[PDB]
Amino acid sequence: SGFRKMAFPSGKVEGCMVQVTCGTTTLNGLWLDDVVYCPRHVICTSEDMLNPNYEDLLIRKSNHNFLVQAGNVQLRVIGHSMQNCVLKLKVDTANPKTPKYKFVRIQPGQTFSVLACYNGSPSGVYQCAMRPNFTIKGSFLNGSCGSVGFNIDYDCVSFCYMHHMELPTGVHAGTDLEGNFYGPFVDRQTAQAAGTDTTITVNVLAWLYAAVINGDRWFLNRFTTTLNDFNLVAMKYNYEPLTQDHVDILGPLSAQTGIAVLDMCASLKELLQNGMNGRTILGSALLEDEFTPFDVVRQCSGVT
């Protein structure tokens, strides 16, 4: 037992990290097969970032201007192309460390691991959730651009995120591996509105199920609620409305603990209305929304 904000093992992703330099800018790239993916802002200087004309900036670049280094070895660039906000650098050597992989666009409220990198070198790994407003509350410094988010299904790495930018608010924005930004963000140094965020209700309920499985049961009560009643409380407390699809995904946890989903909603309703009264749940003094129902089951059953 015990419950931690656990990341996937990063080994398969560490083997894909490279450093990409173009002019004076250095960032991280992802080397899969004979292609290196990196944020397209690698071609900009500071004077360009206010409103870059990426098409024009890229036209002044040739394959030999993109310096790609995989630790000790330099990679030979034989092609370059911009796809949305990512650059794809064709190299003459397939990465021998390429794992089985997929490019996926994750949904808001879903979680993933991030391997934070600087100069093509991994520094650490942590678990994130894509906020309902398509930002991520990461830990990234200058040079972290090109670090990726991923999930792992035994031997398959599904890459879902590539880091691009830190907004003035200190929150993070990036793209799927086809270079499409999550959220309304654009890759330019401009103040940009992140929408109203909400708490991922299905994740808080999954985490309450994790708490019950792991021995923390003080919040369980004699009450029940309905989806409609629960949603009036969710509305007031800026939580995502709960749907039958969320109840359905909570099925396994409801069965394991014998606590009906609406009964757990009534515990969440009381905790929202009353707070924690200075108590903790799984070492947290707030309601945690960064664990999905799948995450809770995976952590509580031991999937490798």
The residues annotated with a catalytic role in the active site are 41, 145
Does residue 188 interact with ligand M7X by CB under 6 A? yes
> Rounded to 5 degrees, what are φ and ψ at 56?
-70, -40
Q: Which listed residue (50, 94, 255, 285) binds a copy of itself by CB under 8 A?
A: 285
Does residue 246 interact with ligand M7X by CB under 6 A? no
Assigned token pair, 10? 């990063």
Nearest to 109 by CA among 201, 233, 4: 201
Distance (Å, whole) CA 97 – CA 33: 9
Q: Which listed residue (5, 90, 188, 217) binds a copy of itself by CB under 8 A?
A: 5
Nearest to 237 by CA among 289, 298, 181, 189: 289
Does residue 239 interact with a copy of itself by CB under 8 A? no
Nearest to 65 by CA among 73, 163, 57: 57
Please calculate the CA angle 147-151-156 and round it to the nearest 5 degrees: 110
Nearest distance in Å: CB 18, ligand M7X? 18
Q: Which of residues 15-54 bind ligand M7X (CB under 6 A)?
A: 41, 49
Of these partners, ligand M7X, a copy of itself, none, which one is at the site of residue 187 (CB under 5 to 8 Å by kind)?
ligand M7X
Distance (Å, whole) CA 223 – CA 133: 32
Which stretch in 54-62, 125-133, 152-160, 162-170 sits in contact with ligand M7X by CB under 6 A?
A: 162-170
Q: Which listed residue (18, 42, 43, 125) binds a copy of itself by CB under 8 A?
A: 125
Distance (Å, whole) CA 61 – CA 118: 23
Q: Which listed residue (53, 93, 107, 121) binds a copy of itself by CB under 8 A?
A: 121
Give the list of residues 6+ apart from residue 182 with CB closer than 8 angstroms, or none: 105, 106, 108, 130, 134, 135, 161, 173, 174, 175, 176
Does residue 271 interact with a copy of itself by CB under 8 A? no
Kindly provide the b/e burial profile for residues 112-143, where b requires at least 16 CB atoms within 10 angstroms of the residue's own CB: bbbbbbbebebeebebbbbbbbbbbebebeeb
Q: Which listed residue (103, 126, 237, 294) binds a copy of itself by CB under 8 A?
A: 126
123 near 117, Cβ under 8 Å?
yes
How many residues bind a copy of itself (CB under 8 A)? The answer is: 53
Q: Which listed residue (184, 195, 215, 251) binds a copy of itself by CB under 8 A?
A: 215
Of these partners, a copy of itself, ligand M7X, none, which one is at the site of residue 119 (CB under 5 to 8 Å by kind)?
a copy of itself
Does residue 164 interact with ligand M7X by CB under 6 A? yes
Element (H, E) at 37: strand 35-39
Binding site for a copy of itself (CB under 8 A): 1-12, 14-15, 115-119, 121-126, 137-141, 143-144, 166, 170-172, 214-215, 275-276, 278, 280, 283-286, 298-304
Binding site for ligand M7X (CB under 6 A): 1, 41, 49, 140-142, 144-145, 164-166, 187-189
